[PDB]
Amino acid sequence: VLSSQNKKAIEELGNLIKANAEAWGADALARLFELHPQTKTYFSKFSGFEACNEQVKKHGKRVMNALADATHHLDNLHLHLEDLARKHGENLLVDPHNFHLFADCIVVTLAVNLQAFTPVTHCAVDKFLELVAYELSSCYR
Amino acid sequence: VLSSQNKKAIEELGNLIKANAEAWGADALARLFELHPQTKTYFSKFSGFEACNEQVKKHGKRVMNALADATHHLDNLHLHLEDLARKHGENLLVDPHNFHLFADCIVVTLAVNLQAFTPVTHCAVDKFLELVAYELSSCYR
Amino acid sequence: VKLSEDQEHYIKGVWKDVDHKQITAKALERVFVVYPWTTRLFSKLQGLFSANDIGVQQHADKVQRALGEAIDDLKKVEINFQNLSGKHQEIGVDTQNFKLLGQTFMVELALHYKKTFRPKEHAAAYKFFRLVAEALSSNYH
Amino acid sequence: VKLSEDQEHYIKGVWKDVDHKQITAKALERVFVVYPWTTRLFSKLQGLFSANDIGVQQHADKVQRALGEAIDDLKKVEINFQNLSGKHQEIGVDTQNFKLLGQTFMVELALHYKKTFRPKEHAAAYKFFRLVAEALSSNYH
Ligand code: HEM
Ligand code: HEM
Ligand code: HEM
Ligand code: HEM
């Protein structure tokens, strides 16, 4: 579970994510596409896969805004992500394994951009991303 | 989630597991040790790792009995597995990744021993094993 | 992934014993039902996912032929599958799906061989499908 | 796992730039905190997991030397690590832990290089640590 200390760490981070949604989102996606090329298959409409690319920037902002919003619903995460869980598990059909891969890339995006990123903060973020991945995988079968 | 149809499938299976706890448990563990040799490191006291081995049989029965009991607490799985979750995450420190590996081996043990194992039944069992793995990984950090 | 000499002999023997198209069709039905998201690029099936359904039978014929080419020369599988791997990326297949099919194939082998599908045999089959998944994922860029 | 020529050159350059023992010690502290179960075989640390703690500094010296041996000949890493791999199984290390250390190492590289740790660099580092994890897991039987 997320302790009271973890929740405060996550809420503070949500504020920074919201402020830098487009740039951090584009960076995280660019990393996902480079380390795990099979993830590019879900974005066949794209004209490019660099962080510099406009389509990458737009999707990145949406993803980060959704992640920032979730940091304000830590007590009711299941109900809050229900709609996104339905979209991914019933319409998009993104293999659930990709949620964990993306989490590991997001952590690196944070490390590159944050002034400080100590192990304690890293732990709180990883636990949060793990819950989000679990909830987004809840409506596949 | 587990539908009403899934729950009945799981409850019926729990009865068969209970009846064959030692043999099925020994088989599932023997498969885990053979496909994933790193799992043997948690059982350094063992004098052997075959299904034929007495220590393998004893641990197998315990694991299967715990799994059979869980099939009767489908509505309250989190609270029911809380004690085992604590043991694994605080004392044993078994890498959580191993829970999924074991699930895939258990499915094969069932396929070898059950008279019939259609895709629908397989799906219900896999969903159950996925929940159990999630709950057993809840107290690591 | 590397198969030992006895493991290569095990897989060659299995291919001589089982009905190629039929066991592959059964493995496909099982993957579509147990892991629903694998049906993403198969809308042409029109919801007909049974082993005996025409569409599944047609795809099974394609997959079994490729498996035969892998088994005919187990030491040069990656070299021989470079073009097939690139083709899968073009089609848009997620490489994780390859691992899921390996799991359903092992369940079908278990149902066919039953008690003779002991831990050693299971390990040999597991390694073979890992080699295949790896070969199919190698030409993704 | 295979590194391209430019990837080999990237990793060689990084090893010339970073403080070997210190960045490894930081990566160790991060793995012990973010993934607590990795401390299983480290009871001798007495709860002292900081990068500057004597016990962590001593283990970091062992790990960095081995990493150097891998980097000196990236094409024969598996051959060169056979004995070290067998030794890890004897010690009782779970092979999954190797992948977790790779993840914390990449976060430390991100903190060191910041903006210059672009997607291409990140991919090169990811592949290197995958090669290392694979080499360390190869002699497990
Ligand atoms: C932190 C995890 C993730 C979050 C919070 C997230 C969030 C979202 C959101 C907010 C949308 C748009 C929903 C709408 O406007 O209706 C979406 C769409 C989508 N997501 Fe996810 N997603 C996540 C991970 C992934 C991953 C790992 C992939 C694929 C490798 C993925 C692929 C897609 C695709 C293909 C779309 C559709 C985009 C479009 O309509 O153009 N998502 N996701
Ligand atoms: C379906 C998943 C699992 C279930 C239901 C389960 C259940 C149990 C139970 C009931 C015990 C004994 C508890 C007691 O009597 O206090 C236990 C002990 C243990 N489990 Fe798990 N376990 C599972 C998976 C695993 C896996 C995958 C591993 C390791 C690779 C593992 C390693 C251990 C160890 C080392 C012990 C201690 C045995 C002893 O005291 O001699 N377990 N587990
Ligand atoms: C691991 C075993 C697999 C092998 C050996 C294999 C083999 C093949 C072959 C030989 C083709 C024909 C390529 C061509 O048209 O030139 C093909 C097509 C295709 N494969 Fe795979 N495949 C495998 C697994 C999968 C999986 C698990 C999926 C995804 C769920 C998949 C989805 C497809 C699709 C969508 C096509 C195109 C079908 C069509 O055009 O009608 N394959 N595969
Ligand atoms: C991936 C990088 C790694 C490398 C290159 C590496 C290297 C080494 C080396 C060179 C030794 C000394 C072997 C000897 O005494 O002859 C060692 C020991 C050991 N390693 Fe690893 N190792 C790695 C990761 C890990 C991880 C992630 C763990 C587990 C969390 C681990 C746990 C241990 C333990 C418990 C020992 C024995 C320590 C002692 O005797 O004081 N290693 N390792």
For chain A, which domains are there?
1-141 (1.10.490.10)
Q: Are A38 and A101 in contact (CB under 8 A)?
A: no
d(CA C22, CA C19): 6
- Measured between alpha carbons, how far is A16 from A125 in angstroms, rounded to an integer? 13
- Determine, for residues B35 and C106 on separate chains, whether the beta-carbon distance falls below 8 Å: no
Q: Which two tokens mark B111?
A: 């396929």
- Cβ atoms of B92 and B77 within 8 Å: the answer is no
Looking at residue B88, the DSSP 8-state letter turns out to be I
Distance CA D55, CA A77 (A): 40
Split into its structural domains, chain C has a count of 1
CA of A42 to the centre of ligand 1 (A): 10
Return the half-sphere exposure (C-beta side, CA atoms, 13 A cut-off) of residue D79.
4
- Cβ proximity of B35 and C123 under 8 Å: yes
| DSSP conformation class of B90 | I
Q: Is C48 on the interface with B (CB under 8 A)?
A: no
Q: What is chain A written as a DSSP string? A: ---HHHHHHHHHHHHHHHHTHHHHHHHHHHHHHHH-GGGGGGGTT-S--STTSHHHHHHHHHHHHHHHHHTT-TTSHHHHHHHHHHIIIIII---THHHHHHHHHHHHHHHHHSS---HHHHHHHHHHHHHHHHHHTTT--
Q: How far is CA C50 from the centre of its chain?
A: 17
- Spatial distance between the Cα atoms of C85 and C137, rounded to a whole number of angstroms: 6
SS3 B94: coil
Cα–Cα distance measured from residue B137 to residue B89, given in angstroms and rounded to the nearest whole number: 7
Closest to C42 (Cα-Cα) out of C67, C23, C62 = C62
Q: Are B100 and C99 in contact, with CB atoms under 8 Å apart? A: no
Continuous H helices in B20-53: 21-35
Torsion, CA B46, CA B48, CA B50, CA B53, rounded to 10: -70
State the best of D34, D38, D96, D134 to mutate against chain B, taking most chain B CBs within 10 Å. D96
CATH no. for residue D33?
Answer: 1.10.490.10
Going by C-alpha positions, the residue among B102, B87, B95, B125 that lies closest to residue B6 is: B125
Nearest atom, ligand 3, residue C63 CA = 7
Which SS3 state, helix, strand or coil, does residue C117 take?
coil
Best CA proximity match to B110, nearest among B67, B66, B70, B69: B67
Is there a contact between A31 and D122 (Cβ–Cβ < 8 Å)? yes
Contact D131, D7 (CB under 8 A): no
Return all residues near B26 (Cβ < 8 A) that are at least 6 apart. B51, B52, B53, B56, B57, B60, B61
This PDB structure is determined at a resolution in Å of 1.6
Q: What SS3 state is found at D62? A: helix
Give the residue numbers spanning the domain of D93.
1-141
Q: CA–CA separation, B101 vs B97, rounded Å? A: 7
Q: How buried is residue B23: exposed, middle or buried, by Cβ count under 10 Å (0-12/13-18/19+)? A: middle
How buried is residue C119: exposed, middle or buried, by Cβ count under 10 Å (0-12/13-18/19+)? Answer: buried
Q: CA angle at residue D89 from D86 to D94, to 5 degrees?
A: 135
B85 lines ligand 2 (CB under 6 A): no
Per-residue HEC secondary structure of C8-76 comes to HHHHHHHHHHCCHHHHHHHHHHHHHHHCHHHHCCCHHHCCCCCCCCHHHHHHHHHHHHHHHHHHHCCCC
d(CA A8, CA B8): 42
Token look-up 């094993």 returns: B129
| Pairwise CA distance, residues A53 & C66, whole Å | 37
d(CA B122, CA B129): 11
* Method of elucidation: X-ray
- 3-class secondary structure for B96-137? CHHHHHHHHHHHHHHHHHCCCCCHHHHHHHHHHHHHHHHHHC
Amino acid at D114: K
Please give the distance, rounded to the nearest whole angstrom, from the Cα atom of residue A133 to the centre of ligand 1.
12
Q: CA–CA separation, C70 vs C48, rounded Å? A: 29
* Residue B126 · residue B9 · CB < 8 Å: no
From the CA of C20, how far away is ligand 3's center (Å)?
15
Q: Please list every residue in chain D followed by a chain break, i.e. its C lies more than 2.5 Å from the next written N.
A: none
Contact in structure between D97 and D59 (CB atoms under 8 Å): no
Residue C121, burial from CB neighbour count under 10 angstroms (0-12, 13-18, 19+): buried
Residues 59 through 88 of chain D touching chain B, CB cutoff 8 Å: none
